[PDB]
Enzyme design. Structure first.
Site, PDB file in Angstrom:
ATOM      1  N   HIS B 100       0.790  -1.244   0.000  1.00 41.76           N
ATOM      2  CA  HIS B 100       0.000   0.000   0.000  1.00 41.76           C
ATOM      3  C   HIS B 100       0.823   1.297   0.000  1.00 41.76           C
ATOM      4  O   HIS B 100       0.256   2.372  -0.123  1.00 41.76           O
ATOM      5  CB  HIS B 100      -1.090   0.047   1.088  1.00 41.76           C
ATOM      6  CG  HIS B 100      -2.359   0.701   0.629  1.00 41.76           C
ATOM      7  ND1 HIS B 100      -3.539   0.609   1.330  1.00 41.76           N
ATOM      8  CD2 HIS B 100      -2.659   1.389  -0.503  1.00 41.76           C
ATOM      9  CE1 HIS B 100      -4.496   1.261   0.691  1.00 41.76           C
ATOM     10  NE2 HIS B 100      -3.995   1.737  -0.436  1.00 41.76           N
ATOM     11  N   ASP B 126      -9.696  -0.563   3.980  1.00 41.36           N
ATOM     12  CA  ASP B 126      -8.450  -1.041   4.595  1.00 41.36           C
ATOM     13  C   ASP B 126      -8.756  -1.410   6.062  1.00 41.36           C
ATOM     14  O   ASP B 126      -9.696  -0.864   6.650  1.00 41.36           O
ATOM     15  CB  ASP B 126      -7.378   0.081   4.501  1.00 41.36           C
ATOM     16  CG  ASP B 126      -5.930  -0.430   4.543  1.00 41.36           C
ATOM     17  OD1 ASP B 126      -5.679  -1.308   5.437  1.00 41.36           O
ATOM     18  OD2 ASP B 126      -5.068   0.085   3.727  1.00 41.36           O
ATOM     19  N   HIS B 128      -6.403  -0.770   8.126  1.00 40.51           N
ATOM     20  CA  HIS B 128      -5.490   0.211   8.679  1.00 40.51           C
ATOM     21  C   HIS B 128      -5.699   1.563   8.063  1.00 40.51           C
ATOM     22  O   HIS B 128      -5.892   1.653   6.861  1.00 40.51           O
ATOM     23  CB  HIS B 128      -4.062  -0.231   8.366  1.00 40.51           C
ATOM     24  CG  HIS B 128      -3.782  -1.641   8.765  1.00 40.51           C
ATOM     25  ND1 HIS B 128      -3.878  -2.693   7.893  1.00 40.51           N
ATOM     26  CD2 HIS B 128      -3.447  -2.176   9.966  1.00 40.51           C
ATOM     27  CE1 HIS B 128      -3.600  -3.821   8.516  1.00 40.51           C
ATOM     28  NE2 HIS B 128      -3.349  -3.541   9.783  1.00 40.51           N
ATOM     29  N   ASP B 130      -3.370   3.757   7.570  1.00 39.67           N
ATOM     30  CA  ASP B 130      -2.153   4.070   6.808  1.00 39.67           C
ATOM     31  C   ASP B 130      -1.789   5.541   6.896  1.00 39.67           C
ATOM     32  O   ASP B 130      -1.442   6.215   5.909  1.00 39.67           O
ATOM     33  CB  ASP B 130      -2.317   3.687   5.364  1.00 39.67           C
ATOM     34  CG  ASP B 130      -2.428   2.210   5.161  1.00 39.67           C
ATOM     35  OD1 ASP B 130      -2.141   1.458   6.104  1.00 39.67           O
ATOM     36  OD2 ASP B 130      -2.795   1.846   4.059  1.00 39.67           O
ATOM     37  N   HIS B 143       4.411   1.330   3.936  1.00 38.06           N
ATOM     38  CA  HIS B 143       3.013   1.042   3.606  1.00 38.06           C
ATOM     39  C   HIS B 143       1.970   1.435   4.662  1.00 38.06           C
ATOM     40  O   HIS B 143       0.769   1.456   4.355  1.00 38.06           O
ATOM     41  CB  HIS B 143       2.809  -0.420   3.150  1.00 38.06           C
ATOM     42  CG  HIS B 143       2.772  -1.433   4.249  1.00 38.06           C
ATOM     43  ND1 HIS B 143       2.203  -2.682   4.078  1.00 38.06           N
ATOM     44  CD2 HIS B 143       3.225  -1.392   5.525  1.00 38.06           C
ATOM     45  CE1 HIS B 143       2.313  -3.365   5.208  1.00 38.06           C
ATOM     46  NE2 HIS B 143       2.927  -2.605   6.102  1.00 38.06           N
ATOM     47  N   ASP B 227      -7.399  -1.993  -0.182  1.00 35.32           N
ATOM     48  CA  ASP B 227      -6.472  -2.900   0.488  1.00 35.32           C
ATOM     49  C   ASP B 227      -7.308  -4.117   0.838  1.00 35.32           C
ATOM     50  O   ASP B 227      -8.299  -4.026   1.589  1.00 35.32           O
ATOM     51  CB  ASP B 227      -5.925  -2.232   1.752  1.00 35.32           C
ATOM     52  CG  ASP B 227      -4.786  -3.035   2.458  1.00 35.32           C
ATOM     53  OD1 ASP B 227      -4.765  -4.280   2.465  1.00 35.32           O
ATOM     54  OD2 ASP B 227      -3.898  -2.384   3.009  1.00 35.32           O
ATOM     55  N   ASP B 229      -6.886  -6.491   2.824  1.00 32.43           N
ATOM     56  CA  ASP B 229      -6.971  -6.843   4.230  1.00 32.43           C
ATOM     57  C   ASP B 229      -8.090  -6.123   4.969  1.00 32.43           C
ATOM     58  O   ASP B 229      -8.317  -6.394   6.139  1.00 32.43           O
ATOM     59  CB  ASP B 229      -5.604  -6.767   4.945  1.00 32.43           C
ATOM     60  CG  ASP B 229      -5.140  -5.348   5.277  1.00 32.43           C
ATOM     61  OD1 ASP B 229      -5.929  -4.365   5.343  1.00 32.43           O
ATOM     62  OD2 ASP B 229      -3.915  -5.253   5.504  1.00 32.43           O
ATOM     63  N   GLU B 272      -1.908  -5.261  -1.719  1.00 32.00           N
ATOM     64  CA  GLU B 272      -1.530  -6.144  -0.604  1.00 32.00           C
ATOM     65  C   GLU B 272      -1.888  -7.613  -0.838  1.00 32.00           C
ATOM     66  O   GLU B 272      -1.937  -8.405   0.090  1.00 32.00           O
ATOM     67  CB  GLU B 272      -2.034  -5.638   0.775  1.00 32.00           C
ATOM     68  CG  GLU B 272      -1.477  -4.279   1.230  1.00 32.00           C
ATOM     69  CD  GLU B 272      -0.032  -4.273   1.740  1.00 32.00           C
ATOM     70  OE1 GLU B 272       0.661  -5.323   1.747  1.00 32.00           O
ATOM     71  OE2 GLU B 272       0.435  -3.176   2.130  1.00 32.00           O
TER      72      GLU B 272
HETATM   73  C1  LIG Z   1      -0.241  -2.019   7.742  1.00 35.01           C
HETATM   74  C2  LIG Z   1      -0.108  -1.037   8.910  1.00 35.01           C
HETATM   75  C3  LIG Z   1       0.618  -1.608  10.144  1.00 35.01           C
HETATM   76  C4  LIG Z   1       1.012  -0.556  11.201  1.00 35.01           C
HETATM   77  N1  LIG Z   1      -0.104   0.378  11.395  1.00 35.01           N
HETATM   78  C5  LIG Z   1       2.268   0.227  10.821  1.00 35.01           C
HETATM   79  O1  LIG Z   1       1.978   1.438  10.710  1.00 35.01           O
HETATM   80  O2  LIG Z   1       3.287  -0.504  10.707  1.00 35.01           O
HETATM   81 MN   LIG Z   2      -3.327  -0.215   3.295  1.00 34.94          MN
HETATM   82 MN   LIG Z   3      -3.932  -2.825   5.431  1.00 34.30          MN
END
Ligand SMILES: CCC[C@H](N)C(=O)O
Ligand SMILES: [Mn+2]
Ligand SMILES: [Mn+2]
Ligand SMILES: CCC[C@H](N)C(=O)O
Ligand SMILES: [Mn+2]
Ligand SMILES: [Mn+2]
Lengths: 294, 297
Positions: B100, B126, B128, B130, B143, B227, B229, B272
């Site tokens: 990502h 997602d 997350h 990000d 990512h 994403d 996930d 991803e």
């Molecule tokens: C895919 C995101 C995982 C975690 N929030 C990071 O920032 O490493």
């Molecule tokens: Mn992502």
């Molecule tokens: Mn993700």
């Protein structure tokens, strides 16, 4: 080597013959990694899909089966090639049955000026030089080179902007020849290496004869019917013929063809993954890789 | 299916340098093997494929705040510029990753394609947000940073890839559930619109789609960054950071179907997919999402 782009035309054509599945050749080569092979050669791939006809197959007795579907496919294919052909890049047509070779040669001829000399190398078990009047099958995939030279019904011969001549053809691997095709080969003195000829003299000598033959031509087009290759290696095809060109000689052939500066277009035809998928598909990908130097 | 365009631009982005696990760069290759080209064939007779150059340099293993910045920079620059040339409001552009971290290149590209005054909306599906920076990232994996970079929070070599920044108000998060302290702070402090996975369960995906239509009604274009996930790990196993209690496959397909119907959507990222973690179940489910987007069912 590498090009700014490769034009990839998928031609889902079965109407040149009777067996289902040859229209899925592009789809199955994609599944086996064809796009990733092109990725080694060019960062840009422009893919075109020719429209698949969706009519019932003419399964009865006839001298030219599903002529409408062969006509319409070859017209679209000619016109697409006319727009995309490029002497600085590469164009690859993936079939589909060999009836598309009429559209394919027609396209190269339409792309070039009327005075251009276009050479054709036809790697095949069959000369594909029958007409409806002498065909044992009525399957138009045994007719395209006849149509390209002006022998055939008006609706097919007229797809050519103008005809090529018998002198423009080099056959490689032929071994299943009908009476009408033998007559043309001998009467017009068409240059050829049968499969047995290739064994006797070797593929190096074949490549040398090609370089000498087309020395004064503008461009060369390769039309590669996988049934040129011995059925030990190519099982997934509708008209296998024994005592063919070895895989090894086929790869050397493709490697040497890929080095010719006059080659800008290639057809890979008659892969029927419904007959046999994996062994055949992978061996076809080795031929294509060899062509490109990978 | 239901959608039909003169062309689809397909950009393959073989990027692993936004995280540590090998295999996510092969996402395009394996989706192609599973029939991605044949899915595009249902939508358009012309597919213009571009491959972004894969970096072949050593992975920066060893603690740091922003690993392999060089590789993420160079990929996102090329991707931005490719998108800037190929983006088309009458056709469709689909970027297949890759991790990502490419979402910075991808948003940057859409922004560069449009006039400097254009309003660009981002839907970010997602687990997350990000939205980390190198100073608060628990991993140093870029990512987890692209949307932060897109809004101007990040190192200069990444934030400068944007022709100009998007703002927090341009984002609509869907399915988020794994949030770090810095990301929570941004979500709350900037009042960023979002539906957590739990929210989706409570209110339903129809309500999510309605909030998107109302939010972007005065924008010029919307970009979707998907994403995989975001989807519950029952259905998406082949990804590097799976998080449980995700969006069901069914809600994901409805979501994609409804997104595909939005007249302002002209570009999509699918990121991803790591086929070296899990190949077939994941790849096929990803192809169903893409099919749904295009109306194929
Ligand atoms: C895919 C995101 C995982 C975690 N929030 C990071 O920032 O490493
Ligand atoms: Mn992502
Ligand atoms: Mn993700
Ligand atoms: C593939 C061609 C086979 C045969 N010559 C025919 O005309 O049916
Ligand atoms: Mn043939
Ligand atoms: Mn043949």
């Amino acid at each position: 080597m590498q090009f700014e782009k490769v034009t990839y035309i998928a031609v889902p054509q079965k109407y040149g013959q009777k067996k289902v599945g040859v229209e899925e050749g592009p789809k199955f080569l994609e599944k086996l990694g064809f796009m990733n092979v092109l990725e080694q050669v060019a960062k840009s791939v422009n893919k075109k899909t020719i429209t698949e006809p969706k009519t019932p197959q003419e399964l009865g007795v006839t001298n030219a089966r599903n002529l409408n579907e062969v006509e319409s496919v070859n017209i679209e294919l000619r016109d697409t090639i006319a727009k995309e052909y490029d002497v600085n890049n590469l164009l690859i047509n993936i079939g589909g049955d060999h009836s598309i070779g009429l559209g394919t040669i027609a396209g190269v001829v339409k792309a070039m000026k009327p005075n251009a000399r276009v050479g054709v190398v036809w790697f095949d078990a069959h000369p594909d030089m029958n007409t409806p009047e002498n065909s044992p099958s009525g399957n138009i995939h045994g007719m395209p080179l006849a149509c390209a030279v002006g022998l055939g019904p008006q609706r097919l011969t007229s797809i050519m902007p103008h005809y090529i001549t018998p002198k423009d053809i080099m056959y490689v691997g032929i071994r299943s020849i009908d009476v009408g095709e033998q007559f043309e080969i001998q009467d017009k003195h068409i240059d050829h290496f049968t499969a047995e000829d290739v064994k006797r003299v070797g593929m190096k000598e074949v490549i040398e004869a090609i370089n000498k033959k087309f020395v004064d031509y503008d461009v060369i087009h390769l039309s590669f019917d996988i049934d040129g290759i011995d059925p030990e290696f190519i099982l997934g095809t509708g008209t296998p013929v024994p005592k063919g060109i070895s895989l090894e000689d086929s790869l050397y052939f493709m490697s040497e063809m890929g080095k010719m500066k006059k080659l800008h277009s290639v057809d890979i035809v008659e892969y029927n993954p419904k007959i046999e998928e994996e062994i055949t598909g992978k061996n076809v990908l080795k031929c294509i890789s060899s062509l490109f130097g990978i």
